[PDB]
Amino acid sequence: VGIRFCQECNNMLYPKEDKENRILLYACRNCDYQQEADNSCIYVNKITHEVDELTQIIADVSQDPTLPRTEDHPCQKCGHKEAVFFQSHSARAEDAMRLYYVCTAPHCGHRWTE
């Protein structure tokens, strides 16, 4: 779900309803500025949390000497043979030991799981 700030005081725009017209309006409080909402979903939260570590992996980890290198998995965006592989190893995890690979060649940063 998105986040909306006031265009007059830059504070949180909270959801609000006008029963007169039956539409969601994101209204600022202590400033009484209003905006026409469009998402129609004020709040969402995931429990199973099917989150992708590839979004959170950073290409610069190709420069880490402690990480292991492999030649068996060439890159896909440049074909570079050497890649650096590792595990997520965070919370929201410890259910998979799957490997995420980063293209070791500079100026590519192509990441992928297999």
Partner: protein, 195 residues
């Protein structure tokens, strides 16, 4: 002096930035104080390690850690940190060549001491926080020789593994052939011997 040097290079001070730049740049801490940010951490770390190895503006005991995945460079200069010297490995080769050994053999009437090894940028002090970012060879003769590749990115090499032991544990002959509580007990008793 570290802060002056970092200001000279392209480090953006915290006051002189919009927050929008903080997303993609590496934060720079000095003794735990966030000083500013930098948009090219690798070159900065190479430069700082070069200076420390040359005994330039950075003294030897200063420790520099790059948390790559969290985009942080933490520089520590305060006292109380514990470190140990490690031989520097570059491109799977030691920087300690035979000429250093020759100069050290005639340590007397030459004044080529340990401090000249440190000044040569061959051996450097590493602390535990920086050990976290170190790929270390247990010994040059085997770990960095060619092989079915285990690791080909060693950064340092142990001088001798036996230097992990203390004073009273270093008088034990063949301590790696004992149950370790017996080594602990001998460490206790050697203080109580007669001599």
């Amino acid at each position: 002096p570290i802060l002056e040097f970092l200001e000279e290079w392209s480090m953006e001070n915290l006051e002189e930035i919009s927050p929008a730049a903080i997303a993609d740049a590496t934060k720079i801490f000095v003794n735990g104080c966030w000083v500013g940010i930098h948009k090219d951490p690798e070159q900065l770390m190479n430069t700082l390690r070069k200076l420390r190895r040359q005994m330039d503006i950075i003294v030897s005991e200063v420790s520099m850690i790059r948390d790559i995945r969290e985009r942080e460079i933490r520089i520590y200069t305060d006292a109380g940190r514990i470190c140990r010297p490690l031989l520097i490995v570059e491109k799977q080769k030691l920087l300690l060549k035979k000429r250093h050994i020759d100069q050290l053999k005639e340590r007397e009437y030459n004044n080529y001491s340990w401090q000249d090894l440190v000044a040569s940028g061959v051996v450097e002090y590493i602390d535990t926080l920086e050990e976290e970012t170190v790929m270390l060879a247990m010994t040059p003769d085997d770990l960095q020789e060619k092989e079915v590749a285990y690791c080909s990115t060693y950064t340092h090499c142990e001088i001798h593994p036996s230097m992990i032991l203390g004073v009273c544990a270093s008088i034990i002959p063949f301590p790696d052939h004992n149950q370790s509580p017996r080594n602990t007990y001998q460490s206790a008793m050697g203080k109580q011997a007669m001599g």
